[PDB]
């Protein structure tokens, strides 16, 4: 009985395992681009005085 | 009826997955581009005299 | 009775450790290539400047 059902919660689990590893991943994808194109639209030295905007 | 139930959760956390991937990609893309063309319009001495 | 249900517990650890294993797994290739894709995007000089925003 306890061997059907957990076993089972292996397949389930392998489930749940891709479910929140393809979440994540493409989350990743979106927010690491994101930046991408944002850093590169900006330019190295555009970005390197907006953020030494100090004296 | 776990196994079940929740291999379904698989495929519904598979699309809240893309949801929230894409939701938050093309916000990217919004708020990346807007501050592209924000300093790229500005200039290189421009925003740096600014700041 | 005990060694029964224990080997079977054997097996259903077997399982669960799967399910942790490739959960954490993928979730890892998750957020590891997020964060490849941002820096390598970023670029060595943008990055170092957004983070040596100091006099």
Same mark, same amino acid.
């Given at each position: 009985r306890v061997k059907k059902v957990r %076993?089972? %919660?292996l397949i389930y689990a392998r489930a749940q395992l891709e479910l %929140? $590893?393809?979440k994540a991943q493409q989350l +990743?994808? $979106?927010e690491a681009?994101?930046?991408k194109e944002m850093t590169e +639209?900006?330019?190295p030295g555009t970005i390197?005085?907006?953020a030494v905007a100090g004296p």
């Open positions: %076993e089972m %919660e %929140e $590893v393809s +990743a994808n $979106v681009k994101k930046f +639209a900006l330019g390197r005085d907006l």
